[PDB]
């Protein structure tokens, strides 16, 4: 692709975050024959059912609602859209490492704080280690913005798929482990075990048994013995810089661009990348990003950006 707006988690065969291809169909007949009135301009447009309307190009179809979906962009054929993931076209620095990276994950806190994907992984892994995931009755376990902002828990839990199979599996075990821990139990310390154990409260010797047979001291977690036993600070300025809608320096890509055909300067007023030239005698339809006539490659790779 020239430019990708969308990322999906591709199960088989990529098992990773990949650019996604946006598709649209008629919600009635399910064919690729829905001509939209207006192209999508944001994630709500392609996630909320029936939000967008058009006309099904069948003589047999009265359908007027669009249904959008994604495919992995890395190969021919339905994966889940990772809507918090954005291409970092304005070079916003990451909240925790302060480097410019792309793509980035953008929290739904009021500040729309921005974290690179490597830092997001490290955020996740640190919180898993330290048992600091956050419980929500309506969700299960998740994490909020790294800065601690309110009302910012991640709700589309498929985002934790981006951690990859092993850490995602640790995340999937966390709830059951936490049940044991909140009940006063202990997890087996043997790497590759971590069974949740519920020994009697006052017993220092814990044996992993129904597990792996390991007898450990629940106080120091080493092999059982008689006798006595032998990341979270977010910079305030870094956080202010790392906000999606904060004012930014001008990049090589200008925000007012000439019409590819008539050269007259053109302002963009929404997320959709299909531009219609405002000049009465021009009316060229073109991709804001690519400077070319509007086409289905641009639709699929970057119909809108955020
Ligand atoms: Zn794939
Ligand atoms: Zn139809
Ligand atoms: Zn980072
Ligand atoms: Zn935040
Ligand atoms: Zn064990
Ligand atoms: Zn000990
Ligand atoms: Zn024009
Ligand atoms: Zn384009």
Author numbering: 141 to 217, 222 to 354, 359 to 378, 390 to 465
What did the article's authors report about this structure?
The covalent attachment of ubiquitin to specific protein substrates is achieved through the action of E3 ubiquitin ligases. Parkin has been proposed to function as a RBR ligase such that it encompasses both of the major classes of E3 ligase in one protein. Our structural, biochemical and cellular data indicate that Parkin functions as a RING/HECT hybrid. Parkin likely binds E2 through a conserved structural motif on a canonical RING domain, and also functions through a HECT-like active site cysteine whose activity can be regulated through interaction between the R0 and R2 domains.
To gain insight into the RBR class of E3 ligase, we grew crystals of Parkin-R0RBR (residues 141–465) that includes RING 0 (R0) and the RBR domains. The structure was determined by analysis of multiwavelength anomalous diffraction data using the signal from Zn ions bound by the individual RING domains and was refined against high resolution data to 1.58 Å. Our 1.58 Å structure reveals that Parkin forms a relatively compact overall structure with multiple unpredicted domain interfaces. We solved two structures of Parkin to determine if there were any notable structural differences between the sequence of Parkin originally reported (containing P223) and the updated sequence (S223). Overall the two structures were extremely similar; however, the loop containing S223 was visible in Parkin-R0RBR but not in the P223 structure. Aspects discussed in this paper were indistinguishable for Parkin with S or P at position 223; The structure discussion focuses on the S223 protein. Each RING domain binds two Zn ions and resolves discrepancies in the literature regarding Zn coordination. The R0RBR structure reveals that the molecule is folded in half with the N- and C-termini forming an extensive interface that comprise two compact domain groups separated by two linkers. One domain group is comprised of an association between R1 and IBR, the other domain group is formed by a close association of R0 and R2. In our structure, H433 is involved in water-mediated hydrogen bonding with W462 and is not available to deprotonate C431, representing an inactive state of the enzyme through misalignment of the catalytic residues.
